[PDB]
From Swiss-Prot, chain A:
Top-rank taxon: Eukaryota
Protein name: Cell division cycle protein CDT1
Organism for this UniProt entry: Saccharomyces cerevisiae (strain ATCC 204508 / S288c)
Claim: Cell division is one of the keywords in the record: yes
Localization, UniProt: Cytoplasm; Nucleus
Single Gene Ontology MF annotation: DNA replication origin binding
UniProtKB/Swiss-Prot annotation, chain B:
Name of protein: DNA replication licensing factor MCM2
Organism: Saccharomyces cerevisiae (strain ATCC 204508 / S288c)
Gene: MCM2
Similarity section: Belongs to the MCM family.
GO molecular function: ATP binding; ATP hydrolysis activity; chromatin binding; DNA replication origin binding; helicase activity; zinc ion binding
Span covered, complete protein: 201 to 864 of 868
EC number from the UniProt entry: 3.6.4.12
Record motif Arginine finger, residues: 451-454
Keywords: ATP-binding, Cell cycle, DNA replication, DNA-binding, Helicase, Hydrolase, Metal-binding, Nucleotide-binding, Nucleus, Phosphoprotein, Zinc, Zinc-finger
Localization per record: Nucleus
Swiss-Prot record, chain C:
Parent-protein residues present: 103 to 840 of 1017
Lineage: Eukaryota, Fungi, Dikarya, Ascomycota, Saccharomycotina
UniProt miscellaneous comment: Present with 13400 molecules/cell in log phase SD medium.
Protein name: DNA replication licensing factor MCM6
GO MF annotation, one: DNA replication origin binding
Organism: Saccharomyces cerevisiae (strain ATCC 204508 / S288c)
Gene: MCM6
SUBUNIT field: Component of the MCM2-7 complex. The complex forms a toroidal hexameric ring with the proposed subunit order MCM2-MCM6-MCM4-MCM7-MCM3-MCM5; loaded onto DNA, forms a head-head double hexamer. Interacts with MCM10.
Amino acid sequence: LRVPVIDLNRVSDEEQLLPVVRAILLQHDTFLLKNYANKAVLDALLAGLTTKDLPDTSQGFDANFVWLEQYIFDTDPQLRFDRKCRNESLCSIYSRLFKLGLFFAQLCVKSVVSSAELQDCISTSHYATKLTRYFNERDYVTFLPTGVLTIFPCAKAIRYKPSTMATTDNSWVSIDEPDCLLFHTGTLLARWSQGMHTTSPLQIDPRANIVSLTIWPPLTTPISSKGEGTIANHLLEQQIKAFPKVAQQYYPRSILRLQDAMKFVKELFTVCETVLSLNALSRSTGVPPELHVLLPQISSMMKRKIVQDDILKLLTIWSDAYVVELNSRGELTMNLPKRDNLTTLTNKSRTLAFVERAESWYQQVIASSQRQKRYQQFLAMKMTQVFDILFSLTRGQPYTETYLSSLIVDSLQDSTKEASEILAGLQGILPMDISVHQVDGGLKVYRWNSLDKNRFSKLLQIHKSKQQD
Amino acid sequence: PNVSRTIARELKSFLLEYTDETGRSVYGARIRTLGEMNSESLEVNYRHLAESKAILALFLAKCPEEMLKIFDLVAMEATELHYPDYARIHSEIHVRISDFPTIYSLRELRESNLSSLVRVTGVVTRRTGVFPQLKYVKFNCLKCGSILGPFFQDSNEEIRISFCTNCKSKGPFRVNGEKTVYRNYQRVTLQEAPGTVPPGRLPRHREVILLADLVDVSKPGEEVEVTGIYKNNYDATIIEANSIKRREVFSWTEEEEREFRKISRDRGIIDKIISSMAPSIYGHRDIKTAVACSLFGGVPKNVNGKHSIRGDINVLLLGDPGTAKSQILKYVEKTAHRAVFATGQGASAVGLTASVRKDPITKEWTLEGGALVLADKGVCLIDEFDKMNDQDRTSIHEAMEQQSISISKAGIVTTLQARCSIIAAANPNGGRYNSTLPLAQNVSLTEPILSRFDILCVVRDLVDEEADERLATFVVDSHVRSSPIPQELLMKYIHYARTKIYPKLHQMDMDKVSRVYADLRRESISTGSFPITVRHLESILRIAESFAKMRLSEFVSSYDLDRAIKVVVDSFVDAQKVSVRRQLRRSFAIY
Amino acid sequence: VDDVTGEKVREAFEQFLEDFSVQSTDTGEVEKVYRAQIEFMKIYDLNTIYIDYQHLSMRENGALAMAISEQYYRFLPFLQKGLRRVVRKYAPERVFQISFFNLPTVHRIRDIRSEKIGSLLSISGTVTRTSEVRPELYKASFTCDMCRAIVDNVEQSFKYTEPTFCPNPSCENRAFWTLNVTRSRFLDWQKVRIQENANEIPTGSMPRTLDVILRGDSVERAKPGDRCKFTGVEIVVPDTYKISFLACHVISIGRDQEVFLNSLSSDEINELKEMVKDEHIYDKLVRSIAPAVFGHEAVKKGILLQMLGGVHKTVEGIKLRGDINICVVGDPSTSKSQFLKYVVGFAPRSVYTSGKASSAAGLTAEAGALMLADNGICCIDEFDKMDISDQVAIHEAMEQQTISIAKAGIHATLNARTSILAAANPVGGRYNRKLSLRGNLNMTAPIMSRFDLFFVILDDCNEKIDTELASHIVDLHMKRDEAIEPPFSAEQLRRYIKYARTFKPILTKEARSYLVEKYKELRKDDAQGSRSSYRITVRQLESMIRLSEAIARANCVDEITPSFIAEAYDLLRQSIIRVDV
């Protein structure tokens, strides 16, 4: 994120700083230019910015819905496109910076091959100067330059969008340099330099006042060999057209490129393919693709909100693509298509196929208390319960001998009078397993730990005294 | 196995060859960048990585562990190619990668989660001091002479070192200060973020370890994110964090919000809400009013670039024994997103005074915050300041003043930033109404601190017949159990408006405020002292702005003005000694 | 063969759980069951299992149950193995913990014997001194670099070392180590030293605690100072060895289907149903509390009620606390509470805290303080000896009875619910006469405000009365013959107490109207003109609620009557006018 500074008077000879500017545009792209012939007149020019009374025809303020506006001023010489207001200082700085751009190409383009070619890019001077304003700031959506070269006076306004470019950390960067004028390289110029350039956005900043000059190649000039089929005017008019911009600019109001809805859905499909791949094939080998897990990963990745509805547009788009099963809970697990390992080749192809189907669709558009007594009887029944609990109280206590008191207490704790009573009744029913021996010192229990508790179960069942007592 | 020998290559390619966004090898840019920065820590968009090669990012998923070891080496070689002499310095560079949701929360992790890389975020609790890693334990014994050699144990066991060296007993072993490798690195208690905790479930502290560059970067009282690899290490689960991300169940929903806005249209929703605030107490419209207000918010708001003023409200709730003065705050405790109930002292944790101390017995020494840093941008809930030791009191004043908590001890010297709004229940010294004498007289705490508190809620009164009626009815009704917004609706709502809206005055008509300020000031000088202050004026502003957030108004309106004015006005009135009666006559215009 | 016999066992068991675990038909609960268990597990996929002994013992005639019980230690491997078998069979990182439950009996600690070793067992007990959970090996991967490392097994008994054999290789050894923290099975252990259940203690041999280690998800299932039941997994630890049981199944067991109380009670269940039929005994009850004391009745009552209910639960906010804290102030002992409290020694969950100098070892790291009196009074003598430390305690105590603990060993809030049977002396002896109670009591600061009731005790001789108690005492002092017998039999009482808890009073409207008037009068009446003591805050009325709850609780109705109401307000009015000094 280095920010070099040089005086243009030292760039004036062009034999000392010429390689340096190319070295930094190869790195920092956008450059910090300072102290040109215009100084206080740049501040005096603000008086003509208060106009804001003109329509479009590539001129006047661009009212766009809302607070943002762009006062574009088409160059005077071109026939039958003009709306003049006041802004004479702007017409002055147009020439004043015409020399600045004609020289800027000499400190840039001349560094490669010759400057004989750049003069053909500047000679028509057909480029429209641009004053810019905001109504009394998130208003700036991330944006790329219309012309191949844009000089502009600035305070801050600039950030750095996430990307792989200069300062690859890709957090937003807002530089503020007094007595300096930042330059911004055009998009098509990157193609002209075959990839040597870069672009940068704006962000939320207190100073709404901004100004720019996008100096632009002639209507008749081809861009290298690759642009014999695409002239600079064609491509660069394309992005400036869209934009809205807004209601009176829908003229044209059809490319094999998205009506953007399609391209976004493409991105989505990308991210989706990615993450489903991720959880499915990775997260667990056996993490099943539930829609709620889903929504997080790409909602994240997108950082945009993914809706189930979007997915239904996707399956709507590639229906072969993913299986999806609403489970109970009503959540829908999505299932990838039937071939376990989704290679990156897989989903490359898939992405392709979807693309085909969409561009196909684009073709289609183009072509078209007694409670007590209750307890009494209940307990009477609980006799049997006690047998079953005692039987097997011995057995789930792998002893079958014991301290009569002890188990008496445990079973007791399950549900003393009742307890001892059961002790008695069982003794009576089964005077075989059980003996009670009064000794000096007391009555000892005797318990035949080998007695058969199944037989004893049926016997306890049958002799409750046959429940007749 | 050596299988990976192929892999590292490919990766280095991706590194090298990578770029995007008008090219600009962001990888190369990274490398050259540090570079002389000599930062020795690499960071990689998992987006890019996954993007390039899945099986890569996957190999991260399952067994990141070795995977990084693979990674860092080829990285280093690459840097050496970039920087030939770099080999000498730092000798190694560790990648932090980037981005892996997931985002396994906190509370949600299983053994299935263990050993695999995991992303998470949360509030920095007490976090350890630093001590150099290189862990090795060893035994000098007693009878069997020495040295039993170094062992490496354990995270954290140090067990059991059974039999060695002659014997193995009874001349048994004693570790020596000489020749045992140590670590400090980064030890951090992190517990689940209070904003997001589900009701009734308590947030769970989990164990974080920091090393190398990660060490000491963070400050407690901060929700940060970290990309860890969950380790049952060892010897209990230790999150091993590769990353740290500075801040950065109920959430607004499109249908929900779209619905919501419609609700926001009506004016009386304010009252309806004020009504919605503390159903159970039967309360006081006013007491509630303040509550709602501070709850709602204010505007921060940075006057470029010097002073941000204060977007917050320190609500002095001056209670009285057996006033529910207790209960009310509890309501908000339920209510608020990030809310910290600190009580008086003694303590109901947190201790409101951040300190770094030795952990229970043996662990690396963890720097923890008071409730404030914890409640930074959240809300600080405390009562019984009279019960607060001056040791705390200084802390309080300090934050209220600076809104940031500096800490110099022991070695660590920092200032955390607690943004919490102050909500306070207090006890009029002794008697409910201590005196007709001004409240500052009628209550214990120091006026300098007090002036910091904007919203003073005084409670009353002498026994009143019908009052006793209505209330006793209310209560009785309650115990017998055995128009206001649906609470949950409200609950998202505040979070929402707080998130979205930023009201803004138009200076055009606002000037009248000043006129008011005088009309107050002068006439106010006549009786009572002072209290009136421009600070108090500012308060009025911040307040009405809260009302606009309530209005969700994005800009300022005379109604919200009327609100605030009435509010602050009354508050001041209530403060004064009984001579305030005389004052009352002039509040009519204020009414 | 042993391999084969045990394997036969394995197959048998797999067959079992595989075999229909459930015969419940029609409305059900139709089969399987255990499969269902497996699935529901797979729902959460938490990889541990709980099962009921009962079905199993039943199925085989329990010959299986037998062999299981007996050889269980031996049997474990085949078991969990077969588990893995069926899991693989019906299901798709492998950790399995299987937990039986529904064992038929309960063994006392002292009842432990060396014959029962290595077989699963059944013990319930009082938890003491829990310990932080620490990872384990289960199986550890440790071996040398020569030639190959981190062989995974054992360290089973606490050793923890080492790789047993077939080292290095080929450095064949001996050698030692090397341990992979990358590869092993951590677990658990939190361990705990639990104490035998108090009531049980045979005189005078006195309690003996034992230790058990909590492994697996049963870890943390425990709570200190709690009666809890555990599955034996018993075995031993070297020391020469010392047995230490282990725990698979942690049950905190130790309300209601008041029936199932009756069913539980069943034998008497006949008897005192009469009592329900019976009446007045609110007297006879009252005519039973502290037979010790002459008069002292308002107390005798108060205790009784304190024992009674009044309901947890709002969910708005506070579960409405049912509990009632009783304060009794008096000129000092000779009975102080020197009588009343000690008497109150006879009760459940009953914590007699002599003095307030402890210092809050109560709630140490059991709330000796409190968690033991959960659903009981901590009869805490001489709060005075609290000095300045306990007021801190009153907070949570009066609050959630949460127990906040962070020694940083953990930060843990232990909720509690325990009645407050409390006490202190007045400032200067009996100061309360002219002096205002508040501030004649002094110390409890706000926690003061936490007290629902207070009986001020002062002694003026009606040498009539003086004589009376005198006689009373004398006879008492006469070893015989004391016919001091409660209007109601005491055992009978405790039983009844069980009953009263069961009831959950309504009612509505009735008394609500009647009461509202009452408070308002109580209230206004209280306030004006002069006033005994503060305030009256409504938290009074809160008490009034609780009070009523005790009264209706006595009625057991279970519903409220303006009668009950009036009573509450009456005794209330009593305490307040008492505050007039």
